[PDB]
Amino acid sequence: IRRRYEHFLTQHVYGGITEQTCDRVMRQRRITRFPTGNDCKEVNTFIQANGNHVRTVCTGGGTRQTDNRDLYMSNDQFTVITCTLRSGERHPNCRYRGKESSRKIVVACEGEWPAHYERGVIV
Ligand SMILES: [Cl-]
Ligand SMILES: [Cl-]
């Protein structure tokens, strides 16, 4: 729960993300394909915002789907950067291309806490 929130922050929340800096952050945060081991995650999206800001999607700043009652779509647009694996199979060799877009974000909320990045939608 608190560990699920912290996992979500690690995987999906980085205010300093750019299209050209996927590789450093994916490596440093050790973001992987599976819950254990060393494998490069194929696709990973960072929301370009702070954690407390992203949390608000679960406490009034989002719309239940629903669809799936655990999923909330943000009312505001967020900038996201999607990092897609270009080469490498294991850290420290994971190389990504990054792509910025502006989207409403859809997060799974476990009560007041974001737990999963479901997707980002446009308009
Ligand atoms: Cl993702
Ligand atoms: Cl490798």
Author numbering: 5 to 127
Sentences from the paper on this structure:
RNase ZF-3e is 17–20-fold more active than RNase ZF-1a or hAng toward tRNA. In RNase ZF-3e, the B1 subsite is unobstructed and the position expected for the 2-keto group of a bound pyrimidine is occupied by a chloride ion from the crystallisation medium. The C-terminal segment follows a path similar to that of RNase A, i.e. strand B7 maintains an extended antiparallel link to strand B6. This is further stabilised by a hydrogen bond between Gly124 and the side chain of Arg107. Arg123, the counterpart of hAng Gln117, is too large a residue to occupy the pyrimidine-binding pocket and its side chain is instead oriented toward the solvent. Arg107 (the counterpart of Arg101 in RNase 4/Arg106 in RNase ZF-1a ) makes two hydrogen-bonding interactions that orient its guanidino group away from the B1 subsite, reducing the likelihood of a role in substrate binding. The unobstructed B1 subsite of RNase ZF-3e identifies it not with hAng but with most of the other mammalian and all of the known amphibian ribonucleases. As expected, its ribonucleolytic activity is significantly greater than that of RNase ZF-1a or hAng. Since mutations that elevate ribonucleolytic activity are known to be detrimental to the angiogenic activity of mammalian angiogenins, this most likely accounts for the lack of angiogenic activity in its close relative, RNase ZF-3b.2 Its enzymatic prowess is still, however, several orders of magnitude lower than that of some relatives, e.g. RNase A. Contributions to this are likely to come from the lack of interactions stabilising the productive tautomer of His120 and the more rudimentary nature of its substrate-binding subsites. At the B1 subsite of RNase ZF-1a, the position of Lys85 and the correspondence of Arg106 to Arg101 of RNase 4 suggest that this enzyme will bind uridine more avidly than cytosine, whereas in RNase ZF-3e, the positions of Thr86 and Arg107 suggest an ambivalence as for hAng.
